[PDB]
Amino acid sequence: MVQVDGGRFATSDLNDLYRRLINRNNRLKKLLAQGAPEIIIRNEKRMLQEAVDALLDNGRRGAPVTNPGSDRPLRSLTDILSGKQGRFRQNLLGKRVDYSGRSVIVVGPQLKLHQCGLPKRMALELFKPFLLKKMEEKGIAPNVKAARRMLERQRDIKDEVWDALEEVIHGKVVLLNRAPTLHRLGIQAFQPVLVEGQSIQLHPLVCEAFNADFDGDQMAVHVPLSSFAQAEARIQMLSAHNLLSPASGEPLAKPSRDIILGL
Amino acid sequence: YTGRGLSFLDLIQEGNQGLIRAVEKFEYKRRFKFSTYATWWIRQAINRAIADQARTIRIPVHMVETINKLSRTARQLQQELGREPTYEEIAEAMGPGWDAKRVEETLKIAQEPVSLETPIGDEKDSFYGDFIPDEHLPSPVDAATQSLLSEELEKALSKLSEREAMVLKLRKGLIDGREHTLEEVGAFFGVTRERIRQIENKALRKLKYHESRTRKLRDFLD
């Protein structure tokens, strides 16, 4: 039951369902102590039974319970764990992650099959913890706290930060993803090449695997962190290593519309 | 009494409690029919239950009466002024002891909580709870600075003498315990409650000297 911002409280529906059960349970105790007739007691027990059902699963038996002045059914324990929006499919089988970005994709024909164009401003945020250590190592900043304060303001970023950022990402790879990911080649590892702009440059030969054209599509960027994550990406998931289709075994990164026309 | 926070069956059960009390007090000598006297108790119980059980954040019965009276007054003025009254009009109509400030405070008390599962959007795919950050647990950035500071401070205290570092840690609560008063520390070392102050103040100066000559401990001051 939080205090949003600095005004108004926000509460879950489980509080309302618990309160109803406690109110009816306490009332039943009072009625029993007063020797009320059987008609009154029988009604109270039936209400108490219905209060438990709504708390455990609202709607299974009878009309769903809704909050005052609303027709939106309360969220019970069962509804929390079930459905496309439940705990299993929303927070356990998939999650939101840190060190991730997104931006529009444009075609880069000068890239090699294992390279991609990553904007400088995206790389600065994605690789921030690595960059701060590099700045401290050199003379750019006195310590990590001072280094972090420097990057907060856009006009306080010196030109040596871009040189240090170039050292940090040396050899590393990032994972590019375009939704929907219908096969495994919808997530591939590329070697970033810092570029001026705000759009990601994608190699022409990997467009068919991603099923991505350049009419306004977008892609997500993820950064493996540890050596095990980096080793797997640079060995198994690299774009230049997956050339044949797992489904049929035929080439999947092959000449396309304009390349075929010229040859 | 329906449509006031409590369901129809809840009102009936609250009424039944009032009806049981009426049978206890009803005096048949007076020659008044039962419904004449029993109606008072039934209404009282259905009205008391609403005040005690109609809100997630409970409000005292006396405050509930004040809020309802404020709503009555602020609605009579609306149709009388042909517009929504300002807080000054409501306060003046209420009577003595009421000002514009109090009217606003009473209205900030009568604000119900907003559910965390109210959808936002045409589809039932987004909710309020998806947009409320957690500001209690320390963030990874804040945790790192706390550990870094302890590491830098620990080395700084390594330049001092062994007892002075223990004096500062004890007096400053670096041992996870509240700051032990000079005396309490004096009993720890069996010395006066003034000697601890003299060494503690002296050592605190030397730490000041080193930081100025190194400036390796100022970025943590925020």
């Binding site: 008609i39 009604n43 039936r46 209400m47 009878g62 | 009936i12």
Partner: peptide, 14 residues
């Protein structure tokens, strides 16, 4: 049966 209010009203009418 499925309506608690309908069921209660019938009970008190006896």
């Amino acid at each position: 049966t499925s309506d608690p209010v309908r069921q209660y009203l019938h009970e008190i009418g006896q």
